[PDB]
């Protein structure tokens, strides 16, 4: 069914939008009101597009796939990881590389090296070599730990990618549009509904609104695994 | 209110949907009323509404779309004038063109009223070709 009451969003930071002279006017038949230097998002079409969002997420996992979620902002960094360890999904820790989806051959070989270095890190032969080799392995393992630590459990492309709002990850988003991979994401008051093909326009100033829509879709995916 | 009242409506259509805005406000003269009457019934647009603002009866016209795409309307509308003021064109019931085989229509001014190629080909009448869309 996947409902959310209108009052649960209407109380929290959902209509609590963004700045009133920064609006990108492809929301001009969309945005409801404006108050005190902050936009007011129309919540009817918001919840309907979230109804559609959970229909098209739960249906896509009902076919049986693996989903992906991007996490980069450092305002919603660990909340995605909480929204991805229980939900079985593979996730971006803090920061993104341009090429992790489209140039995935070299990323795949980079996972050969990252898999071998985790195999050496577990095996206890790390203390054999002195501080030089241990320093190099800790540095490259730190950088791959920054990116590839959260997506070790993926081979191939996902079906639906859900991203940190719009700003920091136009890179990952445009790799998704080049690959054709459908994405269902969050929109601010001043961004594009036509980048992805369905997305969920709600402000992400609130951590609890991010925890709201992401927690909603986490139970959508886990009930997708419920089979 | 320039020189043409038909490049008025038409250029408001092209300039309307090339910026993807699904709403037109134009004047409602007799020939504009007739064109939108023979244009809503042919599936190009959705609705035409007369109203008033300072007791000046206008047409707001809702264009067609589809769903959330790269662009929410797939088939670009492609409106074009033919009989320019200063170069009038006139056709018999022979010359009257089947636009793209029929996927476009050629709205034209018969002695009856203004028709399409269907409603002026069966009549056998001919007249001044206003414009053809496709």
């Amino acid at each position: 069914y996947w409902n959310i009451n209108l009052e649960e969003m209407m109380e929290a930071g959902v209509h609590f939008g963004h700045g009133t002279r920064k609006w990108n006017p492809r929301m001009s038949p969309y945005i409801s009101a404006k108050c005190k230097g902050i936009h007011i998002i129309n919540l009817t079409r918001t919840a309907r597009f979230l109804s559609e969002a959970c229909d098209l997420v739960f249906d896509a996992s009902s076919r049986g796939k693996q989903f992906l979620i991007v996490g980069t902002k450092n305002k919603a960094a660990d909340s995605v990881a909480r929204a991805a360890i229980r939900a079985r999904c593979h996730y971006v820790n803090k920061k993104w590389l341009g090429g992790m989806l489209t140039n995935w051959s070299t990323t795949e070989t980079r996972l050969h090296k990252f898999r071998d270095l985790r195999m050496e890190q577990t095996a206890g032969r790390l203390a054999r070599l002195p501080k030089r080799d241990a320093a190099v392995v800790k540095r490259q393992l730190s950088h791959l730990q920054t990116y590839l630590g959260g997506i070790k459990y993926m081979t191939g492309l996902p079906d639906i990618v859900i991203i940190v709002d719009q700003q920091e990850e136009y890179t990952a988003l445009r790799e998704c549009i080049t690959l054709g991979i459908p994405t269902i994401c969050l929109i601010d008051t001043n961004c594009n509904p036509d980048l992805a093909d369905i997305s969920i326009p709600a402000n992400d100033d609130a951590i609890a609104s991010i925890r709201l829509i992401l927690t909603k879709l986490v139970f959508a995916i886990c009930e997708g695994r419920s089979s | 209110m320039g020189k043409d009242t038909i490049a008025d409506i038409i250029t408001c259509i092209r300039n309307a949907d090339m910026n993807r805005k699904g709403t037109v406000r134009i004047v409602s003269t007799n020939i504009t009323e007739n064109i939108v009457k023979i244009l809503l019934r042919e599936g190009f647009i959705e609705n035409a509404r007369k109203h008033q603002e300072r007791n000046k009866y206008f047409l707001v016209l809702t264009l067609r779309h589809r769903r959330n795409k790269k662009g929410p309307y797939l088939n670009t509308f492609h409106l074009k004038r033919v009989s320019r003021p200063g170069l009038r064109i006139y056709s018999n019931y022979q010359r009257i063109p089947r636009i793209l085989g029929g996927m476009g229509i050629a709205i034209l001014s018969t002695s009856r009223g203004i028709m399409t190629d269907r409603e002026a080909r069966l009549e056998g009448i001919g007249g001044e070709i206003l414009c053809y869309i496709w």
Binding site: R48, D59, A60, I160, G180, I181, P182, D197 | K69
Partner: peptide, 25 residues
């Protein structure tokens, strides 16, 4: 086969991104 599956996915989504921008709300 993989490319075809990807295409089918994209179609599904575009239709899912075709049913309800019309109507709905």
């Amino acid at each position: 086969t993989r490319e075809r599956q990807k295409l089918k996915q994209l179609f599904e989504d575009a239709y899912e991104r075709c049913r309800n921008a019309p109507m709905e709300g």
